[PDB]
Design an enzyme around this catalytic site. Structure first.
Site, PDB file in Angstrom:
ATOM      1  N   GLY A 239      -1.110   3.696  -5.621  1.00  0.00           N
ATOM      2  CA  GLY A 239      -1.986   2.531  -5.566  1.00  0.00           C
ATOM      3  C   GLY A 239      -1.893   1.673  -4.301  1.00  0.00           C
TER       4      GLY A 239
ATOM      5  N   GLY B 279       2.718   3.727  -1.309  1.00  0.00           N
ATOM      6  CA  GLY B 279       3.138   4.115  -2.628  1.00  0.00           C
ATOM      7  C   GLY B 279       1.896   4.237  -3.467  1.00  0.00           C
TER       8      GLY B 279
ATOM      9  N   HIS C 203      -4.496   5.083   5.151  1.00  0.00           N
ATOM     10  CA  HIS C 203      -4.249   6.360   4.495  1.00  0.00           C
ATOM     11  C   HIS C 203      -4.881   6.381   3.093  1.00  0.00           C
ATOM     12  CE1 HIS C 203      -1.523   9.530   2.613  1.00  0.00           C
ATOM     13  NE2 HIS C 203      -2.181  10.162   3.570  1.00  0.00           N
ATOM     14  N   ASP C 204      -4.797   5.258   2.368  1.00  0.00           N
ATOM     15  CA  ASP C 204      -5.362   5.140   1.012  1.00  0.00           C
ATOM     16  C   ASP C 204      -6.869   5.241   1.116  1.00  0.00           C
ATOM     17  OD1 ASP C 204      -2.699   4.710   0.045  1.00  0.00           O
ATOM     18  OD2 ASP C 204      -3.170   2.858  -0.979  1.00  0.00           O
TER      19      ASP C 204
ATOM     20  N   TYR D  56       0.744  -1.269   0.000  1.00  0.00           N
ATOM     21  CA  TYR D  56       0.000   0.000   0.000  1.00  0.00           C
ATOM     22  C   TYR D  56       0.763   1.302   0.000  1.00  0.00           C
ATOM     23  CZ  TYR D  56      -4.268  -2.608   0.354  1.00  0.00           C
ATOM     24  OH  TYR D  56      -5.306  -3.473   0.046  1.00  0.00           O
TER      25      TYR D  56
ATOM     26  N   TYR E   6      -7.940   8.880   1.764  1.00  0.00           N
ATOM     27  CA  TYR E   6      -7.891   9.671   0.528  1.00  0.00           C
ATOM     28  C   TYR E   6      -9.049   9.306  -0.385  1.00  0.00           C
ATOM     29  CZ  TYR E   6      -3.280  12.014   0.862  1.00  0.00           C
ATOM     30  OH  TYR E   6      -2.183  12.776   1.170  1.00  0.00           O
TER      31      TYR E   6
ATOM     32  N   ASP F  90      -3.350  12.792   6.440  1.00  0.00           N
ATOM     33  CA  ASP F  90      -1.896  12.839   6.454  1.00  0.00           C
ATOM     34  C   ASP F  90      -1.342  12.806   7.851  1.00  0.00           C
ATOM     35  OD1 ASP F  90      -1.807  12.889   3.740  1.00  0.00           O
ATOM     36  OD2 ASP F  90      -1.265  14.987   3.527  1.00  0.00           O
TER      37      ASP F  90
ATOM     38  N   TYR G 170      -2.142  22.253   1.651  1.00  0.00           N
ATOM     39  CA  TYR G 170      -2.865  22.657   2.846  1.00  0.00           C
ATOM     40  C   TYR G 170      -1.810  23.225   3.797  1.00  0.00           C
ATOM     41  CZ  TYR G 170      -1.154  18.152   4.453  1.00  0.00           C
ATOM     42  OH  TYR G 170      -0.296  17.092   4.685  1.00  0.00           O
TER      43      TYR G 170
HETATM   44 CA   LIG Z   1      -1.102   3.655  -1.694  1.00  0.00          CA
END
Ligand SMILES: [Ca+2]
Ligand SMILES: [Ca+2]
Lengths: 123, 123
Positions: free
Chosen positions: B32, B30, B48-49, B28, B52, B99, B73
Site C-alpha cells: 500500500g 511497503g 513505483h506504486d 509508500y 504498478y 522495478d 520476469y
Molecule cells: Ca507501496
C-alpha cells in the site's frame, strides 16, 4: 535450464525455434551424444555436452538436486547480446556460461539440413 | 516479482538486504501507501506504486492471473547495471522497467533511518 538455453539461441538467431531446428542434429545435439561430430554445429554441441559434464564435477553443482536442463539461472537478451547475471550462484553461473558459448557457437557455424535427425548409426 | 526486485536493489546497493532495509519505510515503501511522501526515498516508492498501478491498466497485464509481486520476469545484473530482457512479454517488460527505475531511484537518494517503520498516522 532448457527453456533459458532455448531463449539464448533465439537471442542470437531470432528467426529460429531452437527446440525444433537444433534438436536431433548430428551425433551430439540432443539427448546424449557419441562418436565423431559430423560437422561444426555438431561440434558446438559436443563442446556443450563436455561443458555440462564439467559442471557436474563441480562441488557446488553436486549439492543441488537439479539436472542442468532443469537448473534455472538468470540471464538477459538485449540487442541480441546474452548476459549471464551476477545473481547466479556458482553452479548456475557455470551452466549459464556453457549455454551462452553454445548459443554463440550455433550462430557462427553452417547449418546442414542433411544432418537433421541423423541416423544415430553414423555415430 | 518481488524476488527479482529484491535482486535489482541488491545489484545497485550490494551492501543491503532490501526486504529488511527498505520494507516499511515512510508512507509508500511497503504494501500500500497513502499520504504525502515523507522524503525522496519514500517518493521513489510512490512513483513505483504509481508505475504498478499503470501496469494494471494495461490490456496485456490484465490477461494474466498474476500479482506484480508474483509475475516473474527476466533481467540480469552485470557490473552493477540492470538489464531487462527482450524475452519479456509486454506486461512483464513494463513491470521490469518499473522495478529498474525504482532500484536506481533508491540508490541515488538519502536513506533516513528516522522513517523506518514510520507510524502510518503520519500518512
Ligand atoms: Ca507501496
Ligand atoms: Ca548432447
Amino acid at each position: 535450464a532448457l527453456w533459458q538455453f532455448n531463449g539464448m539461441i533465439k537471442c542470437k538467431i531470432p528467426s529460429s525455434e531452437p527446440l525444433l531446428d537444433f534438436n536431433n542434429y548430428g551425433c551430439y545435439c540432443g539427448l546424449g551424444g557419441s562418436g565423431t561430430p559430423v560437422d561444426d554445429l555438431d561440434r558446438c554441441c559436443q563442446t556443450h555436452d563436455n561443458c555440462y559434464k564439467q559442471a557436474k564435477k563441480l562441488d557446488s553443482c553436486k549439492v543441488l538436486v537439479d539436472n542442468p536442463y532443469t537448473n534455472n539461472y538468470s540471464y538477459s537478451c538485449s540487442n541480441n547480446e546474452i548476459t549471464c547475471s551476477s545473481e547466479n550462484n556458482a553452479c548456475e553461473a557455470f551452466i549459464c556460461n556453457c549455454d551462452r558459448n553454445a548459443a554463440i557457437c550455433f550462430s557462427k557455424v553452417p547449418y546442414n539440413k542433411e544432418h537433421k535427425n541423423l541416423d544415430k548409426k553414423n555415430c
